[PDB]
Symmetry: D3
Subunit: 169 residues, 6 copies
């Protein structure tokens, strides 16, 4: 049984990311989705806490009919040592075989540790990235389109827009 690993900040979790996740789910049996930088919250760049993000990511995946048996959602706070980050991820995740990531460091860190590393099967355009979303949330610009309905609801509940706006004064 083959398990893959993915790591992203998910600020917030958007359709782009989701399309990538479904993509990987066609190559592996189970995917371990790691919410990176779980310590950052309340900032224009990282406005949501690990909690809210686990929530968005949980409701969005069970909303798209993706069987809980196919994935794991784990928060991962950043640590001072790059040389200890993989060991850090490993202690928080189930045993995995392939690491999906197009980031040089993440690739190199896992690569150096013996894992098989590849780039995600899909690449979404910046127009769909969180920066657009957050940018729209502030500039009142239909950020919802870029997000899964369940995620909009999470954002609605936690007053995501109100927050990111005040933090922007």
């Amino acid at each position: 049984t083959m398990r893959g690993l993915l790591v992203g900040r998910m600020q917030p979790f958007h359709r782009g990311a989701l399309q990538v996740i479904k993509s990987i789910l066609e190559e592996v049996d189970e995917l371990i989705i790691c919410i990176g930088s779980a310590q950052l919250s309340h900032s224009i760049r990282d406005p949501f806490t690990a909690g809210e993000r686990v929530m968005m990511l949980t409701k969005a995946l069970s909303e798209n009919g993706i069987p809980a048996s196919r994935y794991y959602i784990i928060p991962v706070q950043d640590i001072e040592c790059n040389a200890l980050w993989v060991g850090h991820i490993k202690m928080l995740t189930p045993p995995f075989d392939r690491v999906y990531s197009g980031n040089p460091l993440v690739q190199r860190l896992f690569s150096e540790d013996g894992y098989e590393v590849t780039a995600p099967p899909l690449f979404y355009r910046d127009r769909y990235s969180g920066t657009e979303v957050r940018r729209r949330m502030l500039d009142d610009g239909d950020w919802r389109s870029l997000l899964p309905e369940s995620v909009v609801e999470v954002i609605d509940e936690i007053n995501g827009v109100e927050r990111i706006k005040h933090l922007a004064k």
Copy 2:
């Protein structure tokens, strides 16, 4: 929409705990299951890492037909300050309303923070607790009975018995 919170070490996740979880699931809409002491591993008292435990707890819940939309599985490392632990749980979980727990500290900490706290609707006997399980794993005594099949499989994969035994020399 009502959400409850539960916190346990889950070393390992056993049928007792599971029966309690299904119990709470009849009173609340969603349950946030917190794997406490996520930093302890490789010891007779706490032999499994946060990772393996998220895994057991994930496979056992999707094995009993419990809809992913009804729960959240979050690791929670212990912190030096009891006075900051609830804020610690809150930052890692989705917004919750009721805290289930029969432990004086956990009750008092959440109670003091404004949350509604009650005792779990069900109480399993020690013969079913992790101490029995671990005790059996060492003493070769049919620990499997006490655990959900999916959990046995996790334990099998990570060589749980081999580990806890060596740690016991």
Copy 3:
């Protein structure tokens, strides 16, 4: 009893800060004065150690005759979790009713935690900010004027000018 809270780096404690403290003291019974970033020291931006600033405040608030029963001085180091910061502050301070701040992040954080948040009743021009005081110590300007005597005295003892000047080299 009305307890308010204020939080700033006080690097160093200058007259404006005291003008504001005196004014907040007109609408609240007691004022909790939290020394932010208590862990930063020996830098052009943050030259004094938490210890020294706790000395500056205590000495200035006395020099200006202010019943010690009306204020508290508590150092507070920064934590990597903004979502944990308020609970952190709370754990180190007497129970308070209102928070005084102009910073959006401090404002939002304390607000999301359910506290009454408000702006200081007085805003002081940069001309009298810590930057101006620090820049003078460096360029041999008139820094003593921008500060309470007891503060000038503390700075002389610890050799603040000497230190800040060396670090500038």
Copy 4:
């Protein structure tokens, strides 16, 4: 100026400690009073947070007629490296000259750094220990008589008894 240092858990602050403090003032211009183990709270041995203790101290010292210029109250959280604790204490406090401690480690550590060290002037009788005080709160005893009224009023506000008692269950 001759500043002396004093360190203790103060769980909670009792008349005994107070007289000791007055005694020390009789031989030191100023008394830097460090509240140890600031990170512990909500346990039988350490019921109060630090902020709570900072309140008791600040209140008792202002109600027993003691110049706010003659003392400092600094919460100090314990740290793993004993060989780095005195430095820690220093960093969080004003400059001192003599350490008043009855504890061997506290003595050996401060002296090792070169500080003048000497035992506490008085040695308040028993019936004046946090233990007896905490015990009475548990067993409905007369703890109030062992604490300065100013402190008793604090314990009432934070419902200490109710806490220590629930925690005790």
Copy 5:
């Protein structure tokens, strides 16, 4: 090149430890000597600081003529995550091939990480353990005998006996 690894508290470095180190040096090209619990100091159990023990080893290994090209001395503080410990050790040490330990936990940890694990080639009676050395310094026994001269010399400089004796009071 065959690099082995050893790890112990060395509180203090005694003859037996050296007898074992010399023997491990007969089957490996270089030996990585990790000073465990580098954060503990000033206690009856762990009296010396990482600094001092790094001095003891370096001085003893030289006194006994051992090419410096054959060994490394690296302090290692303990971390709360056993599952992270090996990666921690690795980050601080040259690449190694085999680990020498009698402790089950160190054995299991390094083993689960894929390293060759083996017992020291020599076991020394308690009579010559750190406990015996420490107990003599306290009871005025013959501690110098149980240790290499360079070690006795280091202990004299830092006043190890004085310290250990005071902490005993």
Copy 6:
């Protein structure tokens, strides 16, 4: 015995630093060499782990004919409190007397603690900075000539070039 201290990132160790080290030995009985920022690795500015650096140092010092009794190599991880760094350094090293540093903060901090401080004897030309060395590895330049062979052999073993280059993508 007159021990002097030296601190640097050594990313990586080059001939320049080495000559500086020999120079210092010409005026100090022993040289405590602290490798700073031990917690950084796998970045362009800090490619090597600490264990890697400890290897380069240990190797270069044993191959350039220098008595293992005349030096110590101690990895030092940076810490948040500048006012607690020299104490930190102390705790991890043998007792020293003089600090050789060209850095203003390092100077101001050590001197503030009372240590004799003086600049590095030599001032090795440019073309001998980690920057140039790291640059050459990136641009297939001749970095080897800037490092002692002993170090070059280390970089080859940990495939530094391959790393810094991938990281660079």
